[PDB]
Design an enzyme around this catalytic site. Structure first.
Site, short mmCIF file in Angstrom:
data_model
loop_
_atom_site.label_atom_id
_atom_site.label_comp_id
_atom_site.label_asym_id
_atom_site.label_seq_id
_atom_site.Cartn_x
_atom_site.Cartn_y
_atom_site.Cartn_z
N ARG A 43 0.84 -1.19 0.00
CA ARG A 43 0.00 0.00 0.00
C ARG A 43 0.88 1.24 0.00
NH1 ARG A 43 -3.00 -2.13 -2.22
NH2 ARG A 43 -5.17 -2.70 -1.77
N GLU A 66 -2.17 8.76 -6.69
CA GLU A 66 -2.26 8.07 -7.96
C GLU A 66 -3.24 8.79 -8.87
OE1 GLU A 66 -3.18 3.96 -7.40
OE2 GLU A 66 -1.48 3.59 -6.06
N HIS A 87 1.02 0.28 -10.63
CA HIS A 87 0.10 -0.49 -9.78
C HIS A 87 -0.52 -1.66 -10.55
CE1 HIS A 87 -2.65 -1.75 -6.82
NE2 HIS A 87 -2.91 -0.59 -6.24
N1 LIG Z 1 -1.18 -5.46 -6.69
C1 LIG Z 1 -0.91 -5.15 -5.44
O1 LIG Z 1 -0.25 -4.16 -5.13
C2 LIG Z 1 -1.45 -6.05 -4.36
C3 LIG Z 1 -2.12 -7.23 -4.64
C4 LIG Z 1 -2.57 -8.03 -3.62
C5 LIG Z 1 -2.38 -7.63 -2.31
N2 LIG Z 1 -1.74 -6.48 -2.02
C6 LIG Z 1 -1.54 -6.07 -0.60
O2 LIG Z 1 -0.70 -7.03 0.03
C7 LIG Z 1 -0.88 -6.93 1.46
C8 LIG Z 1 -0.75 -8.30 2.07
O3 LIG Z 1 -1.73 -9.18 1.46
P1 LIG Z 1 -1.91 -10.65 2.07
O4 LIG Z 1 -2.87 -11.42 1.23
O5 LIG Z 1 -0.57 -11.24 2.34
O6 LIG Z 1 -2.61 -10.30 3.48
P2 LIG Z 1 -3.10 -11.15 4.74
O7 LIG Z 1 -4.25 -10.45 5.39
O8 LIG Z 1 -3.28 -12.58 4.33
O9 LIG Z 1 -1.82 -11.05 5.72
C9 LIG Z 1 -1.41 -9.75 6.21
C10 LIG Z 1 -0.42 -9.93 7.33
O10 LIG Z 1 0.02 -8.64 7.82
C11 LIG Z 1 0.22 -8.76 9.21
N3 LIG Z 1 0.28 -7.43 9.81
C12 LIG Z 1 -0.77 -6.59 10.06
N4 LIG Z 1 -0.41 -5.46 10.62
C13 LIG Z 1 0.97 -5.57 10.75
C14 LIG Z 1 1.93 -4.69 11.28
N5 LIG Z 1 1.65 -3.50 11.80
N6 LIG Z 1 3.22 -5.11 11.27
C15 LIG Z 1 3.50 -6.31 10.76
N7 LIG Z 1 2.68 -7.21 10.23
C16 LIG Z 1 1.41 -6.78 10.26
C17 LIG Z 1 -0.98 -9.59 9.64
O11 LIG Z 1 -0.90 -10.07 10.97
C18 LIG Z 1 -0.93 -10.69 8.58
O12 LIG Z 1 0.02 -11.67 8.96
C19 LIG Z 1 -2.23 -6.23 1.66
O13 LIG Z 1 -2.02 -4.89 2.09
C20 LIG Z 1 -2.80 -6.25 0.23
O14 LIG Z 1 -3.77 -5.25 -0.02
C21 LIG Z 1 -1.25 -5.69 -3.03
#
Ligand SMILES: NC(=O)c1ccc[n+]([C@@H]2O[C@H](COP(=O)([O-])OP(=O)(O)OC[C@H]3O[C@@H](n4cnc5c(N)ncnc54)[C@H](O)[C@@H]3O)[C@@H](O)[C@H]2O)c1
Ligand SMILES: NC(=O)c1ccc[n+]([C@@H]2O[C@H](COP(=O)([O-])OP(=O)(O)OC[C@H]3O[C@@H](n4cnc5c(N)ncnc54)[C@H](O)[C@@H]3O)[C@@H](O)[C@H]2O)c1
Ligand SMILES: NC(=O)c1ccc[n+]([C@@H]2O[C@H](COP(=O)([O-])OP(=O)(O)OC[C@H]3O[C@@H](n4cnc5c(N)ncnc54)[C@H](O)[C@@H]3O)[C@@H](O)[C@H]2O)c1
Ligand SMILES: NC(=O)c1ccc[n+]([C@@H]2O[C@H](COP(=O)([O-])OP(=O)(O)OC[C@H]3O[C@@H](n4cnc5c(N)ncnc54)[C@H](O)[C@@H]3O)[C@@H](O)[C@H]2O)c1
Lengths: 22, 331, 330, 330, 331, 22
Positions: free
Chosen positions: B240, B269, B289
């Protein structure tokens, strides 16, 4: 057949073929 | 038949064949909450939205018949989850449809920083000519050896676990920091775990962000924390845009405390190289993105979201829903 | 004695080693006609990179040469058989950049599937993308890695390193090598084919890792390029003489090949405004720098210098560790 | 205060920790009827292994108990819900022998395919084999690991560790778990099924790694054991109540199951001369020691002792790290 | 039609359908060179033999029409290669048919030493009863933690490479010693290489033998070298019986300098627990030389050997042979 | 149909079924 409720019919997206329909 | 509206979009070739005998489909191609047609605000049962539009509590109160919101993707930080629960609106998403696509894109950015490949290709198009060996050592100055380095991961989720497995094949040493996990998760995967964010930054040569954007981690990489990193480290961000303070990052690149940075998401963006705090910063790689797109992934996520709407209409809420994120707040 | 660096100007690493046993000099030559007359008469050993080619006529002009050391792993630019008859030994550094080249090969593969260089290039040109529909159009062509088939030609030091890293991403790996023994694939758990044509029929991405001998010049010629699948990739990081660039350009234009990443070319240095590839879509090129590293550069230069010292203060070829023309030597 | 070890005699590790905050004692009891009267009236905390079971009637006999700490990962021998109503907190050590149990599971799998325990046992009985034909007969039944399918029931801490190690040998891994979220298999690159019947139809070796709740008692019963393939294996290292031993014995005799390796049994201690498995071919048994290690034993005993000290000098359940009945606690 | 004889065997159900229209098949079921029929010594063109019979130069001179010998397996140390070349006899073998079977058996023995499983199963059959936790810690005393240990390999061949890949998944640290290999082989596999045998023994907690039995490594683990190992190390041998001096090994086990040993091949075969220098030695695991057997492997190696004979009869020697080991010595 | 040239017809190998042929 999706209904076109594009009220604010602006043109900030030029995404595809050139429309030359008469 | 009820009405279902796509808030920000124009193409509905995939959802139409599914929701044709149970509802009426429409789109509004809006870019802000002020561009929504009046008919939608009065006669809408469900809605579909991407990440390009943000809804607040005031926006939600303008709807008079909304019952369910389905987010096409994995992130839902642009919707006020708690407020929607009080009003009696359910929020759903697609949890895992692009786990492997995002993991592969993260590894591509890491390799570009070590084995400089995008910068070398860019130099040739500008007209640079290299013939002797001494010229080769100068244009490609800065490449390093991957084996023996340390990789730091913030947030061990679905994407975080996928990256860790692929990074071990290249010889990396992997650490991670996650305060919301149970005990012994690192034992199964054979990794190493730290307890504080400061300790992770002290012993890392490359930092990647994979956490979520809640209200307790806004501007996680701020001015104070960016001075705790090592001399000449890398930084990769694909989760993000609100997790990194771009104003402080630009100063670090100029002074040389950070060797390079690869970014896929930004605070504002769409992104342009001629505007913003990063207007003139050396050693920068940016993408628009698109770390999730794939031919198979795009079709899979659109079909799943459409079928979630159909179950809600022809069932009961929230008993028939599979992926509900505001069940506790729902009344 | 006198030791000369044929193509180079910097000798800060070799000098402290060969200072109490020989005299060091450099020529900074770009062709065999730019070598000083003193070198051709009073040279015992020589050091050379890949930028200069020596033939039999060039070798006969030397009157006191005894050993040639090649800084690198390839020696296709030196006539090995002819040097053996004249009584000259040829050496090289076999493995100093095995892992650097393997990592660079994986970087090119990921750029073709997950388009990253092309997306970064588009932003610098001023392209603006805001809606989701625009995102699907600029990045059109990306695919899913898991389930694909990877074909490797030549399972050497670099070839084995690439195969291990490719399995972590979900690839299916095949290879073709006619000079290996039986059961090598059993140890690594791979699959082996017996003909080059069979490999091209069942591959979605082809990588070249073989050597440039006299039986495989223009291996990817016009006839063989038509046996590949519809919409395949091609990666070349071994040598420039293995691919016919004239036939490759036509394939890219017609669309039979989706993309190609090249690190070595037939004619060097490479320029986008000259050659058969002047205007060809979906092309990625690098200036022959798939081996460079801060640690690798120092390691290969020190090893080559110590090979010269052993030859001077020993016997040839008993004291040499990496000799490639021992059979031809008389 | 007084802290009692219900089933044990050795307290050399816990004593130096809980010496300036409480009084340590042991009972060495084998049943709830062998607990001293002083313990039932003046005990604040307790430590127990898996050899003793506590019910609601047993819990009501305590008059000052406040916390129970289980040295291990399983707590199916304690009535969790009943203890919450009475105001008693239950704790455990979640992960101290994850890797020890995973290694022991792989050892049993290899013994069934590459028969090694049975061959060693035959030599001690006096069997002599000299010719090649004799070798093929004594070791008849060995198979090739690559290409087989492995089925896992319950993908927890131990389940994930086994899956990673099994892929290096060429296995094909499936799993079944109804309490997990979506996309867990995407991260690890595995395959997931939705029903237990589907897993048994397409598996050549079945391993149990789930917990013993009230909805899965006698999971491998008479009806389900007939849905497995012809000539499959079975490994059990989680709990003894998941398998009906009476139905398993009949399958081994008729030949529908080629072999079975067991580490936990319904009735303990285990003896080859008693029980439904008195005379059953192709059986391997161990005395419930898949967790022991020199480092693991010390680690789990120190952690349990420090959990007691925090409760005494803190508040319940705010100061506790691993509490399993927090919801039921009032 | 010519005559082909199986020197040590009785079953020929697989070779018969192949060599039925080009030669005549026969078997001798011999256990020594003195039990070969006179007809074989005069009218034999080819022969097939296992590892149970040894041929010397004097034995080879007794044959009057032998032209080719095919060894069913990978080892040929029981045949005088150089002497057969002078007489004009070609020797062949099956290089790789049981690479993965032997690698899996090696890993099984390693796990039995760390996680004691054969010894625990043996104790139960003897009538031992364990009920309390204290009894469990005593019967299974000696188990260790695999992660963090160092594994030493002598000879990185086909089997040696297979073992190294599987050992890294358990957390081992792998070293190897091989003086006949080129440079950079360890770079491809990401291993560590030493230059002397003494250095390998100093820094190893478990030693496995995977080399060949030539004339320069007889009794490699002798009395002098066995004292250079660490205090309380393991030893696994599955290559050949002549590489280990059993007399010196027995003394080490009794004094406690070696914690355990697993053996699959012995100097004198067949093996018996009641005879030999290892009559009474604690912590010993033995198998009857069956680390290669498999249902698929047995059929594959027998068919390949039969087809090698047919090519020689209906072709030219040694142009038509694929796996010839005495080509240099052949005249 | 393999020819049985087992000259030294000894019995140091009891490897299979019991032969009860008359
Ligand atoms: N195209 C893209 O840019 C794209 C695509 C998919 C996902 N994402 C982003 O990837 C991120 C992760 O996705 P995911 O499926 O692995 O998520 P998920 O919900 O399966 O896992 C997220 C993890 O982050 C941990 N976490 C939360 N707050 C935290 C903090 N302050 N410090 C450390 N760890 C913390 C949680 O405990 C969990 O283990 C999300 O923000 C999602 O929106 C981006
Ligand atoms: N920066 C660079 O571009 C760079 C750096 C290092 C090496 N290289 C090139 O990489 C190549 C491979 O290097 P290596 O160390 O792996 O070599 P190697 O000599 O260790 O192995 C080469 C392999 O190619 C096989 N081979 C030969 N002819 C073949 C043919 N016609 N078809 C198929 N296989 C064939 C050989 O049998 C052998 O297995 C060489 O050409 C080398 O010069 C390039
Ligand atoms: N020495 C030993 O024998 C020994 C040692 C340690 C643990 N264990 C046993 O191993 C088991 C697993 O331990 P863990 O740490 O992996 O546990 P865990 O709690 O971390 O994971 C258990 C998993 O089982 C799943 N599960 C529950 N009920 C299920 C069902 N009916 N079908 C399928 N899956 C189901 C859960 O959802 C979870 O994924 C426990 O029973 C534990 O007591 C035995
Ligand atoms: N069932 C069994 O017991 C069984 C089955 C198959 C093979 N084997 C034995 O396994 C051994 C290895 O087989 P392979 O296929 O890996 O052989 P290989 O010929 O492919 O490789 C043998 C390796 O040993 C190395 N070596 C030779 N002498 C050495 C020395 N003195 N010190 C260190 N390394 C040395 C060689 O250089 C080579 O790398 C052979 O002895 C074979 O007979 C046993």
């Amino acid at each position: 057949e999706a209904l076109d409720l594009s009220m604010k019919s602006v043109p900030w997206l030029k995404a595809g073929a050139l429309d030359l329909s008469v | 038949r009820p009405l279902v509206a796509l808030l920000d979009g124009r193409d509905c070739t995939v959802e139409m064949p599914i929701l044709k005998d149970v509802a009426t489909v429409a789109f509004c191609d809006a870019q802000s909450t002020q561009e929504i047609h009046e008919k939608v605000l009065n006669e809408a049962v469900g809605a579909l939205m991407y990440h390009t539009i943000t809804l607040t509590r005031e926006d939600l109160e303008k709807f008079k018949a909304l019952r369910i919101i389905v987010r096409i993707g994995s992130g839902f930080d642009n919707i006020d989850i708690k407020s929607a629960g009080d009003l009696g609106i359910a929020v759903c998403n697609v949890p895992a449809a692009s786990v492997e696509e995002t993991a592969d894109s993260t590894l591509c950015h890491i390799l570009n920083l070590y084995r400089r490949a995008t910068w070398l290709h860019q130099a040739l198009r500008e007209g640079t000519r290299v013939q002797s060996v001494e010229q080769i050592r100068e244009v490609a100055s800065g490449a390093a050896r991957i084996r023996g380095e340390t990789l730091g991961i913030i947030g061990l989720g679905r994407v975080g676990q996928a990256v860790a497995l692929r990074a071990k094949a290249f010889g990396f040493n992997v650490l991670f920091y996650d305060p919301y996990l149970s005990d012994g998760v690192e034992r199964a995967l054979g990794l190493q775990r730290v307890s504080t964010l400061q300790d992770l930054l002290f012993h890392s040569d490359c930092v990647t962000l994979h956490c979520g954007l809640n209200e307790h981690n806004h501007h996680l990489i701020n001015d104070f924390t960016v001075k705790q990193m090592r001399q000449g480290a890398f930084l990769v961000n694909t989760a993000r845009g609100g997790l990194v303070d771009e104003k402080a990052l630009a100063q670090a690149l100029k002074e040389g405390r950070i060797r390079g940075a690869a970014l896929d998401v930004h605070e504002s963006e769409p992104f342009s190289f001629s505007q913003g705090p990063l207007k003139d910063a050396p050693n920068l790689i940016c993408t628009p993105h698109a770390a999730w797109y794939s031919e198979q992934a795009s079709i899979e996520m659109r079909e799943e979201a459409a079928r979630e709407i159909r179950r809600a209409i022809t069932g009961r809420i929230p008993d028939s829903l599979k992926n509900c994120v505001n069940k506790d707040h729902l009344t």
